[PDB]
Design an enzyme around this catalytic site. Sequence first.
Site, PDB file in Angstrom:
ATOM      1  N   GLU A  25     -18.026 136.230 -66.940  1.00  0.00           N
ATOM      2  CA  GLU A  25     -18.914 136.836 -65.953  1.00  0.00           C
ATOM      3  C   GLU A  25     -19.324 135.762 -64.936  1.00  0.00           C
ATOM      4  O   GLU A  25     -19.342 136.000 -63.704  1.00  0.00           O
ATOM      5  CB  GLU A  25     -20.150 137.434 -66.641  1.00  0.00           C
ATOM      6  CG  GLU A  25     -19.859 138.740 -67.410  1.00  0.00           C
ATOM      7  CD  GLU A  25     -21.036 139.218 -68.258  1.00  0.00           C
ATOM      8  OE1 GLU A  25     -21.591 138.384 -69.003  1.00  0.00           O
ATOM      9  OE2 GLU A  25     -21.407 140.428 -68.191  1.00  0.00           O
TER      10      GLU A  25
ATOM     11  N   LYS B 296     -26.304 134.675 -61.024  1.00  0.00           N
ATOM     12  CA  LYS B 296     -26.104 135.292 -62.336  1.00  0.00           C
ATOM     13  C   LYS B 296     -25.347 136.638 -62.215  1.00  0.00           C
ATOM     14  O   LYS B 296     -25.938 137.733 -61.978  1.00  0.00           O
ATOM     15  CB  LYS B 296     -27.435 135.404 -63.097  1.00  0.00           C
ATOM     16  CG  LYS B 296     -27.425 136.298 -64.334  1.00  0.00           C
ATOM     17  CD  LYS B 296     -27.315 135.512 -65.606  1.00  0.00           C
ATOM     18  CE  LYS B 296     -27.406 136.419 -66.837  1.00  0.00           C
ATOM     19  NZ  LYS B 296     -26.103 137.066 -67.185  1.00  0.00           N
TER      20      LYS B 296
ATOM     21  N   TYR C  36     -19.040 131.548 -68.737  1.00  0.00           N
ATOM     22  CA  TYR C  36     -19.890 132.405 -69.541  1.00  0.00           C
ATOM     23  C   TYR C  36     -19.509 133.854 -69.352  1.00  0.00           C
ATOM     24  O   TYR C  36     -19.287 134.292 -68.238  1.00  0.00           O
ATOM     25  CB  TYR C  36     -21.331 132.187 -69.105  1.00  0.00           C
ATOM     26  CG  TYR C  36     -22.356 133.095 -69.722  1.00  0.00           C
ATOM     27  CD1 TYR C  36     -22.920 132.793 -70.951  1.00  0.00           C
ATOM     28  CD2 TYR C  36     -22.793 134.234 -69.060  1.00  0.00           C
ATOM     29  CE1 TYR C  36     -23.896 133.619 -71.531  1.00  0.00           C
ATOM     30  CE2 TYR C  36     -23.775 135.057 -69.614  1.00  0.00           C
ATOM     31  CZ  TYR C  36     -24.328 134.737 -70.848  1.00  0.00           C
ATOM     32  OH  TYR C  36     -25.293 135.534 -71.425  1.00  0.00           O
TER      33      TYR C  36
ATOM     34  N   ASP D 114     -34.928 134.988 -77.751  1.00  0.00           N
ATOM     35  CA  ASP D 114     -35.726 134.990 -76.521  1.00  0.00           C
ATOM     36  C   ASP D 114     -36.757 136.119 -76.527  1.00  0.00           C
ATOM     37  O   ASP D 114     -37.214 136.512 -77.605  1.00  0.00           O
ATOM     38  CB  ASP D 114     -34.840 135.002 -75.264  1.00  0.00           C
ATOM     39  CG  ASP D 114     -34.011 136.274 -75.126  1.00  0.00           C
ATOM     40  OD1 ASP D 114     -34.312 137.285 -75.817  1.00  0.00           O
ATOM     41  OD2 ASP D 114     -33.062 136.266 -74.301  1.00  0.00           O
TER      42      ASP D 114
ATOM     43  N   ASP E 278     -30.419 136.677 -79.862  1.00  0.00           N
ATOM     44  CA  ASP E 278     -29.267 136.733 -78.960  1.00  0.00           C
ATOM     45  C   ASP E 278     -28.308 135.536 -79.173  1.00  0.00           C
ATOM     46  O   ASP E 278     -28.692 134.374 -78.992  1.00  0.00           O
ATOM     47  CB  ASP E 278     -29.728 136.778 -77.504  1.00  0.00           C
ATOM     48  CG  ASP E 278     -28.583 136.731 -76.542  1.00  0.00           C
ATOM     49  OD1 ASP E 278     -27.815 135.738 -76.590  1.00  0.00           O
ATOM     50  OD2 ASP E 278     -28.450 137.689 -75.743  1.00  0.00           O
TER      51      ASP E 278
END
Lengths: 160, 160, 160, 160, 160, 160
Positions: C9, C17, C43, C85, C90
């Site tokens: 991604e 992002k 990522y 988080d 996660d």
Amino acid sequence: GVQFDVTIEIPKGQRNKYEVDHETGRVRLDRYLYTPMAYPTDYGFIEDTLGDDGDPLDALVLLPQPVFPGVLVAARPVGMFRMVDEHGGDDKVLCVPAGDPRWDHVQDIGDVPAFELDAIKHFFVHYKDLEPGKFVKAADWVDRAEAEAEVQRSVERFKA
Amino acid sequence: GVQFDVTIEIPKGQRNKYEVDHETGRVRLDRYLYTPMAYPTDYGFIEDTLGDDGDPLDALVLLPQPVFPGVLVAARPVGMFRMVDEHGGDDKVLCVPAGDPRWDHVQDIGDVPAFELDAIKHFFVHYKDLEPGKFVKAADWVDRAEAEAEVQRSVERFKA
Amino acid sequence: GVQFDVTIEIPKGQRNKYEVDHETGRVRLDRYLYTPMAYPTDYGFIEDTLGDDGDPLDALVLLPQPVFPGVLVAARPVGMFRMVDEHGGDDKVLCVPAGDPRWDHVQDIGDVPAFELDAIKHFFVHYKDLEPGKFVKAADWVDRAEAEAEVQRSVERFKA
Amino acid sequence: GVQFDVTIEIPKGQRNKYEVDHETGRVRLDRYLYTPMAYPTDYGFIEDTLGDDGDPLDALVLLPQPVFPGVLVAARPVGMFRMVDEHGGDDKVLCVPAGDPRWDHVQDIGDVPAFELDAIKHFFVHYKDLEPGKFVKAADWVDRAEAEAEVQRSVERFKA
Amino acid sequence: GVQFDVTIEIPKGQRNKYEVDHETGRVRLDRYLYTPMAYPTDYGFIEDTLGDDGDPLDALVLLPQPVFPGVLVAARPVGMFRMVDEHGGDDKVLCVPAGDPRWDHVQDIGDVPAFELDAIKHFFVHYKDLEPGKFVKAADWVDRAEAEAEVQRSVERFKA
Amino acid sequence: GVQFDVTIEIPKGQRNKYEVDHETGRVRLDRYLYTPMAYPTDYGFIEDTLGDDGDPLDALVLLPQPVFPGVLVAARPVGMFRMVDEHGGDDKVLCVPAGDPRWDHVQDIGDVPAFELDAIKHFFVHYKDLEPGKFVKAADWVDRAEAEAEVQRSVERFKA
């Protein structure tokens, strides 16, 4: 006469070897080159063609500024790079952008300077030098005429 | 009130004119600009709108860092660039990123500094100067209110 | 044993992002990070996995040269970053490229230098520091073993 | 006949307007352009020349790949851009790289395609459009012959 | 033991062949490579050395991120590339950054993976293939010990 | 009132830590940062200043587009970041470009958005986190006033 769509897989200057998956449409990082070389021009395949090996015919496109993988460019043929590697014969149509008068002076392979053709040829002869089992055996250049004919056949194979 | 998705076709700083083909979804190198200019902001179109000419409404999006062609950004309107070219009228909604508090101070076209609006306007006035038959005739700025209304109509045209 | 496809991604070095919308397949600019940080590695997520939260399992891939968002890379796990988080647990599988012998010396988390694991951990601990409501609570490293197990479960959740 | 050293101040594609301080040798960010334009070619001045205004003669160099500010390139003249702005007359020698056979086909301004000269000319006519008090009045092209003569005089001024 | 300053002339990834002029200090675009290759590592010379030919000893420096031409880096030797070309013998000290614990694991040429040494060697063997009269004849690798000795002599030659 | 020259050592976005050697004038790669961070703005020092520690006063310059290391920019102060690290006190003047009207709306630290000051502060607080022995203890912002005063003192120290 002839003109087609090329799908650029790999931008000029890139050492990442991207490829398009031909059913899913997705783009894939096949491998990072083992030699310190980078693609001599923008590289991809001619949309709606089929070569000897169930793969669309390969294409080099001459551009002022590289594109992004996946980008379509409308192009016309000026010659063809004939190459025989470890999976046998494999050809790459040399193209310029269609309907862009800035490329009008480029009409056949005579019109592309030698130092450019040699640089391209040098890349394909040596890029797999450090990859075991992988080699190159022929490599030469042919004119817009032969390019046009190979295209025509791959278009017809794609319709069968 | 209003907010929508923009598909960026062309990143700020680019001289390659990418466009999305609106049926196939694919991205296309339309042309390389004939003038030594580069898109003043990230440029695209509002997803699910339909303008006067069967084309989705154009959008400019203000961003800190440019995106890639094809990238969706959720955005909100702050004004609109009204321009009449050789194909007649054509408008461009000025956007900021939605739900991003760093842009909270930008609420209408009054909030965008003049030197920025002028730079954008200067790009659309001159980018096609070296392109035969292509010219520009009106070009001005209007507020978030008019932006919001033109969006609304294009959304309704898209549902008919 | 195990190996899978990762959809990158976000390229190493990026501050934008990006994220893939998991039904539409389209890529999206979620946000520009609020801290002066950039993704420590490429990522993405493991294709055909499902985590606890209806989202595919996250993946870090170690590459010599960054790829483009949307690019597929065939990869294999060498460890896993566990992190809790504000939306709770996660995890992020640490991967190298599959069938690339240049990465043969990397077989478990012992084989990745500490300064690298720490750099990666430092990014996830701090990248949301200037984002209200958003925080990080656990963050540590586990071996290829636990990675392999979490993958297996997510594959099985994907088939239910 | 003639050939000289050019010191590139500004790379092709840059919107930052760098300049070399001619006593201290240091490089300086004069200003960021007010228009959404970028230098059409690599831009600098001919080392050891002196124009009408105590400034070395300006130079455009055609290169395959841009250089860094401060970089010397050995170059030869093919033509000259004559321009009259708000500080009056100002000329820019159009150059290719010396002793590089890849530029042998470029011998006078006839050899540079029109679309390129026009793009260059378009940049200098419009780049200061949004800068108060600053304007452009003449702008045209002349051949290697006139380029050569203006160089010769600036070399002689530099020796007095 | 030994450590020195390297002046990087050419960043990893570059196809422009920059060189430092050794009296004037200025940086120069020597040529653009005739082959589609790019420098396999950051490349320069050891400050305050003198080789057989009145030229400072060449250096390769392994870095995470490329620097700019002219940048000093404090470095230490781990081996040496021995090569004989058309001007006869020519050697290149392989370096890592000095006092940087991330490189502590690299102590001799045994510590550099083969695929890396081969990629570097492949570059110097082939980069001048399309350049008339220019060729390469020997090309091999030697250890930190021989590196250290050749440095020592070039330092002593520089003091005479 | 006050305005001065800044020599940018490190461009916005860079992770390489360049520094200018203050006698030789040469630029140096000090180190590659150990954290996955990049300089939040262009970073350098005020030319002809002397701090407490025989080093010129540090400066942050806000620019639309990053410059190259070594580039001079004429600038004016709008505030100062006070910070105490492991070598004790260390301050960094916040600057905008001098005589550029696009920055006229930025006159004191009140005029820089909080998210920006926080981003900058977040970088200096954390960038050395993975560096043994190195830490940060104070870190806050003061106005153009105090900036102007510290500059004045450093100018006067430079003349003694």
